[PDB]
Amino acid sequence: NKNTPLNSGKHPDLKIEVAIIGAGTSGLYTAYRLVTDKKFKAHDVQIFDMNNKLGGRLESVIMPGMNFWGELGGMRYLTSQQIVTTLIEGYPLSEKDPNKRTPVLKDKMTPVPFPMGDPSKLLMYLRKERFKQNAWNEAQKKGEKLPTRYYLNENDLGFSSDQLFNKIIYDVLMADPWVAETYGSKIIKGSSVYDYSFKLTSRDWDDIKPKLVYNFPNSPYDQRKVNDIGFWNLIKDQVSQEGYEFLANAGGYYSNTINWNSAEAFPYMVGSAGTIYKTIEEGYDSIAYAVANSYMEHEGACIWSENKLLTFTKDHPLTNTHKYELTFLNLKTNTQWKVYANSIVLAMPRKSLELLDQNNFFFNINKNSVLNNNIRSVIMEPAFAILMGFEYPWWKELGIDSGHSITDLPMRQCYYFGTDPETNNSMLLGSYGDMETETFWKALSDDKVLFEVKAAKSASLRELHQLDDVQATKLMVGELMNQLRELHGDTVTIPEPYVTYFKDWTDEPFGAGYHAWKAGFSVENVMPYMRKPLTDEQIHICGEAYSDQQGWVEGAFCEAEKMLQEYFGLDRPYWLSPDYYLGW
Amino acid sequence: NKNTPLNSGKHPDLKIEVAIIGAGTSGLYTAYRLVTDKKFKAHDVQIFDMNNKLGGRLESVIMPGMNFWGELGGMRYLTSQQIVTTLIEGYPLSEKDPNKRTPVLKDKMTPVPFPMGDPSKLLMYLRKERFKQNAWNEAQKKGEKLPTRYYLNENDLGFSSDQLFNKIIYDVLMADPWVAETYGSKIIKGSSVYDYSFKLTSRDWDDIKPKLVYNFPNSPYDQRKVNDIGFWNLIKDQVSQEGYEFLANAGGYYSNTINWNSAEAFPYMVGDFSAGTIYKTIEEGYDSIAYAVANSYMEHEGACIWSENKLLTFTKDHPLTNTHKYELTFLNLKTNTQWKVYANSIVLAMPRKSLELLDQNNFFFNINKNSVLNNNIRSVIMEPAFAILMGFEYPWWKELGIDSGHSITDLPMRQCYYFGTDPETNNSMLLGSYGDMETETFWKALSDDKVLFEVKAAKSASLRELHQLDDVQATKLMVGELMNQLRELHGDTVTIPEPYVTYFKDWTDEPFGAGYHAWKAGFSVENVMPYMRKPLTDEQIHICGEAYSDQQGWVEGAFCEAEKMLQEYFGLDRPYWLSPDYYLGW
Ligand SMILES: Cc1cc2nc3c(=O)[nH]c(=O)nc-3n(C[C@H](O)[C@H](O)[C@H](O)COP(=O)(O)OP(=O)(O)OC[C@H]3O[C@@H](n4cnc5c(N)ncnc54)[C@H](O)[C@@H]3O)c2cc1C
Ligand SMILES: Cc1cc2nc3c(=O)[nH]c(=O)nc-3n(C[C@H](O)[C@H](O)[C@H](O)COP(=O)(O)OP(=O)(O)OC[C@H]3O[C@@H](n4cnc5c(N)ncnc54)[C@H](O)[C@@H]3O)c2cc1C
Ligand SMILES: N[C@@H](CCCC[NH3+])C(=O)O
């Protein structure tokens, strides 16, 4: 099922219609739709990737001793996300009997609820104070305002990150008279001082984001579109720099507090009625294999692996039959070869576009200044993944079965991932890094001395030594361990891990775990621009990077889907609800 | 003096010996040394720069209404920095009467002390608590430990940033039995629990840096070289993450607490010992020293700075291989035309970002061939810096008894310098400097906004005179928000009027990409610097400047790497005016 054939060879002067570069979710989706809907013969639609596997920022692994999937990248979806959810669970989404669902993909994918853990037992370690994540509510129940070691404005005393986030969004929304008048019924202040709520639809947000004005006559930002203010800028303005410190640390990875587009950050922070987080039992990269395999069933279909796009020109022998000559580097031989095509789908993030030849007709800055301006419209957020295997789930000593702990320590957030009921070998995702913490972790992960795998139950040295290459560094494992002991306190002994799995998503060609719209850009005009930057060229960009659901597979799918409907003459899939809002 | 001629023209197929690219301090210094010592005729040594001025990261400006120089880049030097000090002040450095000194450069430069201000009156604003910088020392004088809103380890309670830094570096140095035994006399615990001091020379540090071992039994970094540990990694290990938070915030810009090479951070933090040394500047603007070196170079006949001429690439494959090893292709920015220069030596007097912006596919940079060059180019952190000069109609900071110096905060602005009052006009200058600890991204969104602060007349400053600065004004959003932070910083007992003029430079802009550079942990710095001065054995191509110096942040770093390069590969002797006991390493 994950043995989808990959061709690391070359086919000099291959002639095709559509060259898809990026075997990520969006590249795979594009190929699947084109050939499934018979817009093109499989042999005329080809995917190229420089990697030695498909899926890009989806990579599921198994570590000896633990018979279940760890995620180095994407790990879960929301049933709000209708392209990825329908693909996994069949259609229609309304049918709630899973045996009256019609499958869309053949590949076996077993949906399973994402365990969220217990906030009575999940930790919050801020400025050396240890809390249960529930401590703000428990204090509110008892009429109290929880003291913390952040000096908030007095009006915000006792608030939780979530409630204070809600208050900031409510306050800013209601200060726009037009937003108050038109959507005030969807922007609700409850009875309790802490309770705010929203019923704003994706559609309502597309109306609000380009028009929202920041209405605060003493602020340096007064009478500016919220589109034009960084989220850090905006949060400090509303609740002081100590307010921003509290939210940026207490929010964890569920929160994006970088200084990105306030207008885009609003819906990102406050969310479709009755949705939940799920994953796939067979690994979250199963959705990529499933889309890939559906494409590769057609003979002529090919993923060219370990083949890196260098450049592309209109000035080549074959202009009578093919607009574009693409030059590929075949990595196994270090030889270049040519591919001829009439359409190019760059299914790749910002960093991957910047690593392509910047001097060709498409990227040359002396011609396409506007394209380069639009490529630079998104922040490249760093992420890494360190998976750690322990001989027993030491976290269960604190009544923690699953979920995440949050700290202002450089580790920021850990996920208690699961236990092998036969071995008791148990998995932590210790990581992701982010704001500032990239440089803290990068000095340690760049170090040359790798963690030494250690034998465990159902995990022999000769099984483990196959993972030598992908171990975290001793310095990074040592220091993460030191922080986990500090995070969890002295009432639990944490033993040394026996195996690790490390990936850094800042590495080329990814340059980022995820992307974030910059303040000052008309997101609603950039997105359609990137799906076809030049009027008289059949070159398209798709993927998560320039989507409005950054952070998610669903963003990559939606930009591919819109590109398909816009330029490749496809209708909405038969299996996708006509009410799922896509946009323009 | 600052009217040094620049040639924005071209001269196709110019045939020289040494092309120096970058008319910054190291490039100017290289050309000045080469001609003054008569190693080549001035027509055989040319300087090319893409800028419309010389000086690079030195740029001194005058704003209408204020008859004194503001600094967009470098401000100050230390009298222990012997090249930059001797070129400014003349020699010998022992002579304490300036009128008894012997000039080295003909251009006149008035050395003045850099006002450091009064720690009684300068502010520290941390987690919404307002301190005077001397509050820690005041508390200790009464036998007290000053509580703060940072939850230090108990053993560290009541330490100032300066004291806690010395304790950290003392503790780490002294835990190494070799360092203890060999340099314990120069690593000094005073009487008070807060008093740590260092007498380690430049030479002592060069012996210590590669050898020092982190000796803390249950540390994650135990038994590793301190050179292989990030400074944030080390600080946290030593005083907890709350301690790092205190030290990173309360440290000025003086302080470099990014996660760079710990071995290199130690000397940066506690000086190369000459305890009688002080900070000074040039009355005529700190860029004066670039102009003095550049003018000394230009008084030789055939000397030329090619301005607005950008190096694109260079090759060994050209028609003239019989006389000239290298063809350089420049872009003449005025005509948008490419012209060639032929040369046998290339001096890239430019930082990391500048190197990376050159053609990476040529024989020199090609990563498929020169993996070691590329690793080493990437051995320094590009640290962001912005400068915003703000001119007010009076020095509102005098209401708090502040004459000069720096106030420090955890607010995004991080630090402001009170730069001076024009005694005729009362027009008074403030610098906000910011960029470290993620404040880059806070400020970038505001400085990338396109509505600019509008100038406004004041005494001896007419809109006619101010409108020439329209293009260099800060954004309105940035000036508004910095003004809001200065009000929060100083408190509600002083009214801060809106300013009448600003001046913004972003040093992350190309081709600089950084204010200054920082060695990464885990590199053999003592081996990377010699490499960078001549990466390839078969090639007379050399890199000099501040970025790969061991005095990062400083003009003296640029001068020293050029000086070493001149002695190593251009057969120059030590300048007659430079003490032979000024340590330049190997
Ligand atoms: C740590 C982390 C956690 C995440 N968690 C989740 C989550 O829980 N849920 C979720 O839905 N999403 C999550 N995501 C995001 C999700 O993984 C991505 O949004 C999605 O996989 C991106 O797909 P894409 O189509 O944009 O392409 P990418 O995944 O970016 O793939 C692009 C491909 O292009 C290839 N390429 C680049 N340049 C070239 C070239 N010159 N020639 C050939 N090939 C080239 C690369 O090798 C790569 O395979 C997470 C991401 C990370 C990093
Ligand atoms: C905010 C700030 C504060 C500082 N404070 C001090 C201080 O107080 N005291 C002190 O001593 N030092 C200070 N410094 C450091 C000092 O300014 C620098 O270290 C010094 O100027 C570095 O000189 P350099 O030779 O490395 O070249 P740079 O000054 O980096 O100049 C390099 C030159 O190369 C040119 N160039 C690059 N690429 C090309 C190309 N392709 N073609 C043509 N030209 C090119 C650039 O235009 C530039 O003119 C400060 C720096 C900054 C940013
Ligand atoms: N979707 C990601 C989080 C997005 C991160 C954006 N900075 C996850 O669930 O892990």
Numbering used by the authors:
A (entry chain B): 1 to 271, 274 to 586
B (entry chain A): 1 to 586
Copy the relevant paper text.
AncLLysO has a fold typical of the flavin-dependent amine oxidase (FAO) superfamily —the Rossmann-core fold, which recognizes FAD, and a hot-dog-like fold, which is important for the recognition of substrates. Taken together, we assigned a novel FAD-dependent enzyme, called LLysO and bearing a main L-Lys α-oxidase and promiscuous monooxygenase activity, from the database.
In AncLLysO, K387 corresponds with the residue, and the activity of the AncLLysO(K387A) variant was reduced below the detection limit of the activity assay as expected. Structural comparison between AncLLysO(LF)- (green) and the L-Lys-binding form of AncLLysO(K387A; magenta) are shown in Figure 5D, suggesting that dynamic structural changes could be confirmed at the following residues: 251 to 254, 383, and 516. The active site residues E383 and Y516 moved to the optimal position to recognize the L-Lys associating with the conformational change of the plug loop in AncLLysO.
